[PDB]
């Protein structure tokens, strides 16, 4: 009776597509055609943080917009003071293969993970000096890809085992698990209100999960290739995506369909990092073409190019106040960009 | 103000300490050569890992990271074992490895196409187009027994055997039949043709027929790695 279940599956999918189309009336490019473009915005490398021994794979700012943590495949977690371009902490890592790093909102914890399949949590404010491994979150039967602290005690980590999870640091076991992605889950972003999070996988689709329940509410789709970078629009009602199909996409939570594709004929390499600005108007995405293109959110127009990286960019984020955007690439260099007046 | 100046001085002192430690770790990182061991389930990768775990004091959810010294040179050979069948995204973490030691069963005569496609993917990957591959055609003795005993014919699986002959630059082992030379070099030339019919001048393949004694295996790895680093230093110095 597997054929009957398949028939029901296609019937439900057709019904969902019909509902989305019935809710699809006007394209966002149509309504925002009248929106005044931000124009050509230029930004420069105010501070180029250097010291990373090997390629940079991930970066995460702090809530105070001052401290950022960058992970390198050398096996280091360097915490930088962007305002004064000094290194505050350097955490040697057990496994050199690091694919993620997270800064806790409270500022007292850092996270890391990679091919070792274990999420490593580090205390920054121990009673004594130096940084030590707090807990080792084990149970992911695959490489960790992205992790983000919900709160000082909880953390939701995404893995290549086609299943995300939310952990308890003290407990150390997966309190809730999130299953449903067919391929490797790579990215993970938290809503401004810590109630929901979305994760995009190698199944060329992105799913939205509810933290306190454990089932994915919606499954946004549309990307031709695997979704390798995700981020949340600041409003909390939208989220943008990055795929190796060279087309960033914006999906809104409510209408539950594609809104625009940020595409260009010249661009053929894949996006690697996506992060909206504070007003949500500027979507900054990095590519394998060794530079970042800032995309207007309301109009599919390239605002500017953040050239300056020799190798492919891997991470990109903005401060909580949006004062600056820092992009790390595989040339072991992390560079902060800030608008020029 | 005075307190802010003291905080700035303390932060600078922390910077100096971290920078000294980072220079030391840069020294140890430049010294160390990172090798990646790849292969299929039927390939002798597991045997090599088990051997090297105890021979070189292997440190050991599935990353077999071992660091050893051979002739005062630092090596870091690792195998991704805990990951699932998908290999298109955790392989990007290995774009900077010194070499990719590829282990092929070479006696399955059935799964050789999977190994060929794996070598194609490794060679033509955009992020591994710089990395040389040390081709390790393992289980050469088993292939010799299979060819000598007859029974299965390689012509059934690979059809180009009927129009292939030993190259003039052939190095058979002293006492050993022509047919097994033909089969062995057919496999080697299949891999080499797959390698050469691609971008050259950046990465090269190092075919090797694994023998019973593993010291020759380690010697071939060492020589290939030295060659790779020599060529890379030629590239950075511009003399290429």
């Amino acid at each position: 009776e597997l054929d009957q279940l398949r028939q029901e599956a296609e019937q439900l999918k057709n019904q969902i597509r019909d509902a989305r189309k019935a809710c699809a009336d006007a394209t966002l490019s149509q309504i925002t055609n009248n929106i005044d473009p931000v124009g050509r915005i230029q930004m420069r490398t105010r501070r180029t943080l250097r010291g990373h021994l090997a390629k940079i794979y991930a970066m995460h700012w702090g809530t105070d917009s001052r401290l950022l943590v960058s992970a390198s495949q050398d096996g280091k977690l360097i915490i930088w003071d962007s305002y004064t371009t000094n290194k505050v902490h350097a955490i040697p890592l057990r496994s050199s293969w690091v694919m993620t790093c997270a800064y806790a909102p409270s500022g007292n914890y850092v996270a890391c993970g990679g091919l070792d399949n274990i999420c490593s949590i580090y205390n920054l404010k121990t009673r004594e000096g130096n940084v030590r491994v707090s807990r080792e979150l084990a149970g992911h039967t695959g490489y960790l890809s992205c992790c983000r602290f919900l709160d000082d005690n909880q953390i939701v980590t995404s893995s290549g085992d086609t299943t995300c999870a939310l952990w308890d640091i003290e407990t150390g076991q997966q309190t809730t698990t999130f299953t449903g992605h067919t391929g490797d889950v790579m990215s993970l972003s938290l809503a401004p209100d810590t109630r929901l999070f979305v994760s995009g996988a190698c199944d060329a689709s992105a799913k939205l999960w509810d933290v306190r329940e454990g089932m994915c509410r919606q499954t946004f789709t549309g990307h031709e290739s695997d979704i390798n970078a995700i981020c949340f629009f600041p409003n909390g009602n939208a989220f943008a995506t990055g795929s190796d199909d060279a087309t960033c996409r914006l999906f809104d939570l409510r209408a539950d369909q594609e809104l625009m594709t940020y595409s260009h004929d010249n661009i053929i390499c894949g996006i690697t990092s996506v992060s909206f600005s504070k007003s949500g108007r500027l979507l900054l995405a990095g590519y394998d073409d060794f530079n970042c293109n800032v995309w207007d959110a309301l109009k599919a127009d390239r605002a500017g190019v953040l050239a300056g990286h020799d190798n492919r960019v891997s991470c990109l984020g903005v401060t909580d106040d949006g004062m600056a955007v820092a992009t790390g690439s595989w040339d072991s260099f992390l560079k902060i960009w800030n608008g020029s007046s | 103000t005075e307190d802010q100046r003291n905080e700035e001085k303390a932060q600078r002192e922390a910077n100096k300490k971290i920078e000294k430690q980072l220079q030391k770790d840069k020294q140890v990182y430049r010294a160390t050569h990172r090798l990646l061991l790849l292969g299929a389930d039927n390939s002798g990768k597991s045997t090599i890992v088990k051997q090297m775990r105890i021979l070189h004091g292997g440190s050991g959810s599935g990353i077999f990271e071992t660091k050893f010294q051979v002739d005062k040179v630092n090596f870091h050979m690792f195998d991704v074992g805990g990951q699932r069948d998908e290999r298109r995204k955790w392989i990007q973490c290995f774009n900077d490895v010194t070499a990719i030691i590829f282990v092929v069963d070479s006696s399955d005569y059935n799964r050789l196409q999977e190994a060929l496609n794996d070598f194609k993917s490794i060679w033509n990957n955009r992020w591994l187009r710089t990395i040389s591959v040390i081709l390790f055609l393992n289980k050469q003795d088993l292939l010799a027994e299979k060819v000598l005993a007859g029974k299965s014919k390689i012509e059934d699986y690979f059809p180009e055997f009927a129009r292939y002959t030993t190259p003039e630059d052939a190095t058979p082992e002293p006492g050993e039949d022509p047919r097994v030379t033909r089969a062995k070099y057919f496999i080697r030339d299949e891999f080499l043709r797959i390698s050469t019919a691609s971008g050259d001048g950046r990465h090269y393949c190092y075919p090797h027929f694994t023998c019973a004694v593993d010291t020759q295996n380690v010697k071939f790895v060492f020589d290939a790695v030295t060659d790779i680093i020599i060529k890379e230093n030629l590239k950075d110095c511009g003399l290429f």
Partner: nanobody, 129 residues
Framework: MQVQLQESGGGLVQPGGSLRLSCAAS????????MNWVRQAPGKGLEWVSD????????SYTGSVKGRFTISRDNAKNTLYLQMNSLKPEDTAVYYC?????????????????????RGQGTQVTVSS
């Protein structure tokens, strides 16, 4: 839309016969992808059979099918054709048409893996006598 690849043409045929395979595709620009053909003999894994480039310039076949099957790529209809000729019982399997993971690139890495999104349910080509 959701990436889909629906195979067709699977059916019973006596040894030495012929068969046609069609892979209707949607949701992605068919032109810039190295489409492949993979198959599963009973009690075996996924074996790569044939592949084709963006425009058909470079085609390759598994040695077992070197002189038996042809691959055609009609970019207009977004359909991949695997012509099945001179069938023998060793070819019985469910045939899945699979797309290379990334556009404008020739590194088809995860095509024969146990789970792979850019593929199809497939059709069973039975060569029973």
């Amino acid at each position: 839309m959701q990436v889909q690849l629906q195979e067709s043409g699977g059916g019973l045929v006596q040894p030495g016969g012929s068969l046609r395979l069609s892979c209707a595709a949607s949701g992605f620009t068919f032109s810039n992808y190295k489409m492949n053909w993979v198959r599963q003999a009973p009690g075996k894994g996924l074996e790569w059979v044939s592949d084709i480039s963006q425009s058909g310039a470079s085609i390759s076949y598994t040695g077992s099918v070197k002189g038996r099957f042809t691959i055609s790529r009609d970019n207009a209809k977004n359909t991949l054709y695997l012509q099945m000729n001179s069938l023998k019982p060793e070819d019985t399997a469910v045939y899945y048409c699979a797309r290379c993971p990334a556009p404008f690139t020739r590194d088809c890495f995860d095509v024969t893996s146990t789970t792979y999104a850019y593929r199809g349910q497939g059709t069973q080509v039975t060569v029973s006598s």
